[PDB]
């Protein structure tokens, strides 16, 4: 099932006010299934297990850069339905495409 956008990222944890990261080589991507729904998933590049698979409709989410993280390229998939924040730190070698991937995420989530 072809992907629509993919890029190496890892995960992080939001304890209280404190976003803590995860060490695994993960990957973020967006996939369209045969019934057309748009999924936002994250899978373990190591084991290959897909730990996250969310069906996303226009206006569900924003995928944004996180300013409070200087030491990493932290992005947050955030929901208007509540306090579901989902944190990811870019694991790509070159930062050249961080911002294109951020745009294309938002684009496919909200313009499918």
């Amino acid at each position: 099932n072809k992907y629509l956008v993919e890029f190496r990222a890892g995960k992080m944890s939001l304890k209280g006010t404190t976003v803590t990261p995860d060490k695994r080589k993960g990957l973020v991507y967006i996939q369209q299934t045969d019934d057309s729904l748009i999924h936002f998933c994250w899978k373990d590049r190591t084991s290959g297990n897909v730990e996250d698979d969310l069906i996303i409709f226009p206006d569900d989410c924003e995928f944004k850069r996180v300013p409070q993280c200087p030491s990493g390229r932290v992005y947050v998939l955030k929901f208007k339905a509540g306090s579901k924040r989902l944190f990811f730190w870019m694991q790509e070698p070159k930062t050249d495409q961080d911002e294109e991937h951020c745009r294309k995420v938002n684009e496919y989530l909200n313009n499918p």
Binding site: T17, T18, V19, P21, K25, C69, S71, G72, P93
Partner: peptide, 12 residues
């Protein structure tokens, strides 16, 4: 190669 994890940061 591949970046190092970020240091924990407060979320605001």
């Amino acid at each position: 190669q591949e970046p190092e994890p970020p240091e924990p940061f407060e979320y605001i």
